[PDB]
Amino acid sequence: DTLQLDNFLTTGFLDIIPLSQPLEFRREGLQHGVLDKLRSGKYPQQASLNLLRQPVEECRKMVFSFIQQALADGLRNVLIIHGKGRDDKSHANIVRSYVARWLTEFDDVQAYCTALPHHGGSGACYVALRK
C-alpha cells in the first residue's frame, strides 16, 4: 500500500539542518560492507527521486511512495534530489531537513550521506536500502 493513509512520515518540530552540516546517518549493527554501497553504488535514473520545486506535503507523498516502490523493486540504493539552498530557511534546506528525518523512519533505510558532485553534490543524497 502506497496509499497515503499508510504514510507514517512525520512533520512538525522540524529540526532544521544548518547548511554547514552534511546529511549523514548510519544505523547501528550494519554489516562491514554497507557503507561502500553508498559510495560505489550504481545510481541509474529510475533509482533517483527529483524533489526540486515541490511543496513540502508533495515531497512527503513522493518520498514515501518512491521508497515503497524502490523496496518493492529490490533497489539497494537510491538517490534523492532536494536541491541546494542559499540559507538555513530556504525551501531546499527545509526539504533537505525533512528528507533527513523521513529516511530514518523507514525500517529498511540503513544509511544515507551527501552525494558526490557528479550526482548533484550537496543538493542530493545517497540512500542505502536493505535488500
**C-alpha to C-alpha distance for 25 and 61, rounded to whole angstroms:** 22
What residues contact residue 20 under an 8 Å CB cut-off, 6+ apart? none
Q: Coil, strand, or helix at residue 56?
A: helix
Residues 109 and 16: their CA atoms lie apart, in Å, by: 20
- The CATH fold assigned to 1-131 is Ribosomal Protein S8; Chain: A, domain 1 (3.30.1370)
Report the structure determination method: X-ray
Give the span between the Cα atoms of 2 and 101, in whole angstroms. Answer: 19
Please provide residue 75's backbone torsions phi and psi, each rounded to the nearest 5 degrees.
-75, 135
H or E element at residue 49: strand 48-50
**Backbone torsion region of residue 60, taken as left when φ is above 0, otherwise alpha when ψ lies between -120 and 50, otherwise beta:** alpha
Q: What residues have CB less than 8 Å from 99, skipping those under 6 apart? A: 23, 51, 59, 63, 80, 82, 125
Return the closest-CA partner of residue 84 out of 41, 38, 52: 52
State the Cα–Cα distance between residues 87 and 116, nearest whole angstrom.
21
Cα–Cα dist 65/68, whole Å: 5
Cell 561502500 locates to 36
Could you tell me the resolution of this structure in angstroms? Answer: 2.3
Domain ranges, ordered by start, for the chain: 1-131
